[PDB]
Design an enzyme around this catalytic site. Structure first.
Site, short mmCIF file in Angstrom:
data_model
loop_
_atom_site.label_atom_id
_atom_site.label_comp_id
_atom_site.label_asym_id
_atom_site.label_seq_id
_atom_site.Cartn_x
_atom_site.Cartn_y
_atom_site.Cartn_z
N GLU A 1 -8.77 -1.14 -0.97
CA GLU A 1 -7.45 -0.63 -1.14
C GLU A 1 -7.51 0.81 -0.80
O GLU A 1 -8.35 1.56 -1.30
N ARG A 2 -6.56 1.23 0.07
CA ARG A 2 -6.38 2.59 0.47
C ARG A 2 -5.68 3.20 -0.69
O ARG A 2 -4.66 2.71 -1.14
N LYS B 1 4.73 -7.50 2.71
CA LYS B 1 4.01 -8.14 1.63
C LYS B 1 4.25 -7.57 0.26
O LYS B 1 4.44 -8.33 -0.68
#
Lengths: 187, 50, 499, 168, 468
Positions: E182-183, E156
């Site tokens: 979001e990491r 992605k």
């Protein structure tokens, strides 16, 4: 909103009463009349304590109000409207509760601290006075706030003495020292 | 060494129960009254320093 | 004697008890005291009862402040004075907890002296920023050869050890900790991973065995065991990983590296469920509170490898998740899988078939992976990944007349599977992982009989140790496998193969 | 003990201060606590059930819960627009929408506001949103054709006019 | 000065008591001065008695009741400007790029109402793309929602990066990549990578703006990152006339964040643990994704479905909004194709005959038939033998494997990553290529002459080069 916020539940009535009569500036009058109806509550103990029980109708409840205001006409006028409210809301169990709450709220508006010196013994009046003097001397009393101080006897306080007022306490107890001793002499 | 460590633990908990006997002695005595006076005046001095 | 020392200490407390704000319990039921007072209290602040109970204050409601008691309700009763300690939860942090089994508060439950550690720092603090991190590249080697090769692990990262109940999940974890002794002995402080094992809901007898085993392997002196045992209360359990993380922060902040193993967050979940329900907050999906995602995420992003301006340090983490029926589809596993960066999924069948490690190779991934892999081991085990892939397909070919290629694969693959067995509680050195896998890659081991693989392994290692520990040390120290080394290794393997 | 809408301290204060607010609560209301796209209004005592009320936010609502002392309107509109203690005036009519002939070639929203914006809607009347179904006696069997142009849906599904037929 | 005192802090749901007739309106933003700078609470109820119930954006840990609050007066106003491109921005509109205070022109409310029926797109438009697979089988559309499926990393994110490059060529557009749940480690890599591939250059020009919303950030701030991002995009669209392409990450984490806030607000979460206000939350957000008369937003969203369940209501709601779905396959990446796109599982509803042009459609239908037959034929052809192909079937196989290679077309961003400079292929020229391949003009030209090339012109060059 008017000084001293009370988050009483059914004490919202007292709060309301306070601000409403504060804005009509008939609070001393209210307090006095409230004392008088409170006195007539105590001086009506049969069916004025023993028929504070919820079993009264609307119509019968109203007629209890009517009998009470026949007994005296010393009423704030706003508390006669409050009497109406309490009859309609069928608030009768927290009726003396509202009285107490308005009294505290009122005498807080007037300014007056409360206090107690729970002890394991009934202390001297010399002690009461010396402590009261001390407390007034301490910056805790900043004036605009008076004091009530009742030493009470409680066997539960074991060791020391405990002074309480203004949500400020000094709690001398044996138990905490015993606790530290126990824990360390078992470990 | 094991019984020595055990004996030390045992001695302290025995002597702890002897302290409980001393606790009962203090709360009976009118040292309870005289130390209440000491505590009272100490709170007067302390709280005045606030 | 000792008694005298305690009495002296008691004489040393006499402090003015002018408690600015006190409280009185209005009603205490269910460990949810509702207190009247505590006007200026900070949220989650530590409160001390007359009973001496410690609490946090999750609900600050207008009429009552709903303390959640850490302590037992046994002594608690209505009206109890509630002194306001005025300090949100903090625990000692520092190298003082090395070889110290402590409860969440910081009390040494092993009683290895009152904890003297650098500072006491609060339990919850928010996770490092974007720019406060730099990408992982530093390996960490768990001694478990399969872990190191199949799913190579690095520093300041999260990656699960998700597997079925009582498969010695803790055993798999413990093996990593043991290998960290070797690196710990090593001078570099990135090589000194100061492990933290967070034993959650684990009965004190079990943790006592853990402690004893750790003591046997002399690991308690880089190990820290934060303990919230089965008995230990759900607030303690709730705050236990957060508390643990803060200990890790001192090391991380000091730029060192360390490894925190949260075992198992599944039991953390239950404690939060208990808490939420007791505060009557609606329980989320699978009756596990709705903010469990939020809870776990808050914890799990504290595991981070900081930037080099933030003094290149880390807090590596390896959460352990218990899969009740093996369902990674279960709500808490699915969430956690999403949150984390890799998972290792041990396979129960393999465990039953005595293959320990019992790792399900397919259902194990590391996203950082080969970035945090020793170059030597990378070279000689890229092949291993492909071979195993074929072996998986040719697993079903074990049901026989087979293509010669398939039959060869089956033989090569079976020998490999046995090679990756490593008896529980015995780590291996990296300098000895790499030759063995090279042999298998060169198909040297394929010829060696399956039963004689075991004999071959230990013997080969000694044979290598005798023949050329010059090579082994060279391989170890270079950390790369040069064509000359791989050449010599093929030859060496041939010589060993002959015997 | 119990919580009653009159216990709201400002309401409570009016009752204490003499009594009520001069019969303004029979045909106008003033909004109390609000949020969740429903509002609890004090007054509107002459509210018809399922009336359309217009709030001063412009938001209009259909009275849903007629309760002793309070009415729970449902806001046909966004929350931000509405604000507490706002004055709600009765439309005085049950929820009706303009109906007529001149809606052929018109896009309207549900309030009948032309969102094609091809001027105001030419609508003969307005008619109440809910109207009872014709009974057995005013019903008559169908026989008119509806041809869909899709052979299957016009040779395996016969459709005629005035019917009730699902498309799933 | 509208101010109120904190009267509860049960969770992140902070009830504030305001003095009479000095009440905020719903969706206003309150700022509590704190040693945390500010705590932004968004008014989400009026509880009456001159008290409200608000939600928090910034954590409330250690909050003291009775603290004075100051009312901003309306939904958070976040900085906007061309200046603000190339800023990593937190929910409260403050730099988290850490390159200091955002240089801003105007600031604007985070909540905004969808444009009118009139100002909605009256007729479809096909946003240009440069990936051939995209340009045939799922052509981008202005105001469209394109839902990504398939793994990240080489999947992605590289695809997203390509799009930024393409957009810069295509219009000169901008983007805002908003990342929810979001990491932060992965985000750092993405930011650093985005800097490296120069889509962000702060020593140059930064087209994409980043909004990273970490999972550790409270659920309320997770919910509000999206609304903020859309506003930034809308400043470009409406007020700079731009056509932009706005990436959103996981809508699972969009749902997840919203669901919690509902549950906290005490609203009964509907079935499959998803908020009662689920529909409206997507509805407001994804009706602000449209082609206006001024500009057009277009949004590429990443649709991570939990447990692969499309039956789950939140994915279903997403699919209702989705105009296209891009379904990256890892099998495809393994066939040496970057594009990683699965052509047979990539579908758009804007692909209809008239919509994409009749020629484009007919070519597409043929390519679909070709691929569909190629796959199906290959199933039993592999087993039976390649010589069991008919003359027609092996003509199709010959053509098809040539198409399979033709899919390979490096990406401009992946110039480094594949090692081959990307081949940008314009939509008209994609059709041209396939017309010729269908007519077998390149069926006498080798398979790997189509490997890693772009349009018709490109494969003229490569046809010659493969031989010579």
């Amino acid at each position: 909103p008017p000084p001293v916020r009370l988050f009483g539940v059914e004490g919202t009535y007292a709060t309301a009463l306070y601000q409403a009569a504060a804005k009509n500036s008939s609070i001393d009058a209210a307090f006095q009349s409230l004392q008088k109806v409170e006195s007539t509550v105590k001086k009506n103990p049969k069916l004025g304590h023993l028929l504070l029980n919820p079993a009264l109708s609307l119509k019968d409840r109203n007629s209890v109000i009517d009998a009470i205001v026949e007994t005296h006409k010393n009423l704030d006028g706003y508390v006669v409207n409050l009497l109406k409210v309490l009859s309609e809301n069928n608030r009768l169990g927290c009726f003396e509760k509202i009285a107490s709450d308005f009294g505290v709220l009122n005498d807080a508006h007037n300014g007056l601290l409360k206090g107690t010196v729970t002890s394991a013994e009934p202390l001297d009046p010399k002690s009461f006075k010396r402590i009261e003097k001390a407390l007034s001397a301490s910056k805790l009393v900043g004036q605009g706030k008076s004091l009530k101080l009742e030493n009470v006897v409680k066997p539960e306080i074991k060791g020391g003495l405990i002074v309480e007022l203004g949500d400020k306490t000094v709690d001398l107890s044996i138990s905490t020292k015993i606790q530290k001793l126990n824990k360390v002499l078992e470990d | 060494v094991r019984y020595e460590a055990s004996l030390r633990q045992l001695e302290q908990r025995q002597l702890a129960k002897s302290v409980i006997s001393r606790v009962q002695s203090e709360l009976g005595n009118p040292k309870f009254q005289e130390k209440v006076l000491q505590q009272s005046i100490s709170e007067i001095e302390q709280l005045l320093s606030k | 004697e000792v008694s005298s020392i305690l009495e002296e200490r008691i004489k040393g407390v006499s402090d003015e008890a002018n408690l600015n704000e006190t409280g009185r319990v209005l009603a205490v039921g269910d460990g949810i005291a509702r207190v009247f007072g505590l006007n200026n209290i900070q949220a989650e602040e530590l409160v001390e009862f007359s009973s001496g109970v410690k609490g946090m204050a999750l609900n600050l409601e207008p009429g009552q402040v709903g303390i959640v008691l850490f302590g037992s309700d046994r002594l608690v009763k209505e009206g109890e004075l509630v002194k306001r300690t005025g300090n949100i939860v903090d625990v000692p942090v520092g190298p003082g907890l090395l070889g110290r089994v402590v409860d969440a508060l910081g009390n040494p439950i092993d009683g290895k002296g009152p904890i003297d550690a650098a500072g006491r720092s609060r339990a919850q603090v928010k996770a490092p920023g974007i720019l406060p991190r730099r990408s992982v590249h530093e390996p960490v080697q768990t001694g478990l050869k399969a872990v190191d090769a199949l799913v190579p692990i690095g520093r300041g990262q999260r990656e699960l050890i998700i597997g079925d109940r009582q498969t010695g999940k803790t055993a798999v974890a413990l093996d990593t900790i043991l290998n960290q002794k070797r690196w710990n002995n090593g001078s570099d402080e990135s090589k000194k991973l100061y492990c933290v094992y967070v034993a959650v809901g684990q009965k004190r007898s079990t943790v006592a065995q853990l402690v004893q085993t750790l003591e046997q392997h002399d690991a308690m002196k880089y190990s820290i065991i934060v303990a919230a045992t089965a008995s230990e209360a759900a607030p303690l359990q709730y705050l236990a990983p957060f508390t643990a993380a803060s200990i890790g922060e001192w090391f991380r902040d000091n730029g060192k590296h360390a490894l925190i193993v949260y075992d198992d967050l599944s039991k953390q979940a239950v404690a939060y469920r208990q808490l939420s329900l007791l505060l009557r907050r609606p329980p989320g999906r699978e009756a596990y509170p709705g903010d469990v995602f939020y809870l776990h995420s808050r914890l799990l992003e504290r595991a981070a490898k900081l930037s080099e301006k933030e003094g290149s340090g880390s807090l590596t983490a390896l959460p352990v998740i218990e899969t009740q029926g093996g369902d990674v589809s279960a709500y808490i596993p699915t969430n956690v899988i999403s949150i984390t960066d890799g998972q290792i999924f041990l396979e129960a069948e393999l465990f039953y078939k005595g293959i320990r490690p019992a790792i399900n190779v397919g259902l194990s991934v590391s996203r950082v992976g080969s970035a945090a892999q020793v170059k030597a081991l990378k070279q000689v085990a890229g092949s291993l990944k492909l071979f195993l892939a074929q072996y998986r397909e040719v697993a079903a070919f074990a049901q026989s007349d087979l293509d010669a290629s398939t039959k060869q694969t089956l033989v090569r693959g079976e020998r490999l599977t046995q090679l990756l067995k490593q008896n529980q509680y015995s780590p291996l050195a990296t300098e000895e992982q790499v030759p063995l896998i090279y042999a298998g890659v060169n198909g040297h081991l394929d010829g060696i009989e399956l039963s004689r693989i075991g004999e071959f392994e230990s013997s080969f290692l000694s044979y290598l140790k005798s023949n050329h520990n010059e090579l082994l040390t060279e391989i170890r120290e270079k950390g790369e496998l040069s064509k000359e080394l791989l050449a010599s290794l093929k030859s060496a393997t041939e010589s060993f193969v002959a015997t | 003990t119990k919580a009653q809408p009159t216990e709201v301290s400002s309401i409570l204060e009016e009752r204490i201060k003499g009594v009520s607010d001069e019969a303004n609560l029979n045909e106008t209301g003033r909004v109390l606590a609000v949020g969740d796209g429903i509002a609890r209004v004090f007054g509107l005592n002459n509210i018809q059930a399922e009336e359309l009320v217009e709030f001063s936010s412009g938001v209009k609502g259909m009275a849903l819960n007629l309760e002793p002392g309070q009415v729970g309107i449902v806001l046909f509109g966004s929350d931000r627009l509405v604000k507490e203690g706002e004055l709600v005036k009765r439309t005085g009519n049950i929820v009706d929408v303009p109906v007529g002939p001149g809606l052929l070639g018109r896009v309207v929203d549900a309030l009948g506001n032309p969102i094609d914006g091809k001027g105001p809607i030419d609508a003969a009347g307005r008619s109440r949103a809910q109207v009872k179904a014709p009974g057995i006696l005013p019903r008559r069997s169908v026989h008119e054709p509806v041809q869909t142009g899709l052979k299957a849906v016009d040779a395996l599904v016969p459709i005629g006019r005035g019917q009730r037929e699902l498309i799933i | 000065p509208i101010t109120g005192k904190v009267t509860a802090v049960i969770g992140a749901i902070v009830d504030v008591h305001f003095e009479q007739s000095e009440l905020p309106a719903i969706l206003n933003a309150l700022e509590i001065k704190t040693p945390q700078g500010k705590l932004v609470l968004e008014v989400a109820q009026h509880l009456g008695e001159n008290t409200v119930r608000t939600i928090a954006m910034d954590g409330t840990e250690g909050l003291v009741r009775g603290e004075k609050v100051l009312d901003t007066g309306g939904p958070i106003s976040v900085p906007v400007g061309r200046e603000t491109l190339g800023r990593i921005i937190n929910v409260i509109g403050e730099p988290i790029d850490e390159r200091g205070p955002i240089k801003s022109k105007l600031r604007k409310p985070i909540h905004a109402d969808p444009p009118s029926f009139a100002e909605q797109s009256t007729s479809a438009e096909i946003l240009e793309t440069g990936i051939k697979v995209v340009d045939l089988l799922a052509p981008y559309a202005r105001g469209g929602k394109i839902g990504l499926f398939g793994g990240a990393g080489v999947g992605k994110t590289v695809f997203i990066q390509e799009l930024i490059n393409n957009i810069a060529k295509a219009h000169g557009g901008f983007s805002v990549f908003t990342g929810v749940g979001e990491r932060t480690r992965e985000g750092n890599d993405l930011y650093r990578e985005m800097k490296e591939t120069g889509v962000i250059n702060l020593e140059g020009e930064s087209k994409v703006a980043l909004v990273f919303g970490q999972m550790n950030e409270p659920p309320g701030a997770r919910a509000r990152v999206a609304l903020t991002g859309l506003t930034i995009a809308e400043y470009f669209r409406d007020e700079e006339g731009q056509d932009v392409l706005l990436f959103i990450d996981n809508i699972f984490r969009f749902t997840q964040a919203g669901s919690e806030v509902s549950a906290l607000l005490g609203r009964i979460p509907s079935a499959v643990g998803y908020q009662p206000t689920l529909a409206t939350d997507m509805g407001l957000l994804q009706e602000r994704i449209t082609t206006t008369k001024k500009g057009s937003v277009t949004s590429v969203q990443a649709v991570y479905v939990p447990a692969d369940d499309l039956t789950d209501p939140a994915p279903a709601t997403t699919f209702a909004h989705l105009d296209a779905t891009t379904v990256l396959s890892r099998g495809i990446s393994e066939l040496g194709i970057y594009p990683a796109v699965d052509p047979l599982d990539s579908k758009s509803r804007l692909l209809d005959a008239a919509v994409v042009g009749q020629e484009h459609y007919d070519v597409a239908s043929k390519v679909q038939e070709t691929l569909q037959t190629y796959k199906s034929l290959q199933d039993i052809i592999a087993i039976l033998g390649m010589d069991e192909l008919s003359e027609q079937d092996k003509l199709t196989v010959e053509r098809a494997r040539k198409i399979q290679r033709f899919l390979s077309q490096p990406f401009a961003v992946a110039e480094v990553f594949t090692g081959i400079p990307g081949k940008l292929v314009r939509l008209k020229d994609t059709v041209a290529s396939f017309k010729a391949v269908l007519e077998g003009k390149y069926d006498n030209i080798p398979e790997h002459a189509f490997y890693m090339v772009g349009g018709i012109e490109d494969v003229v060059a490569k046809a010659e080069k493969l031989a010579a």
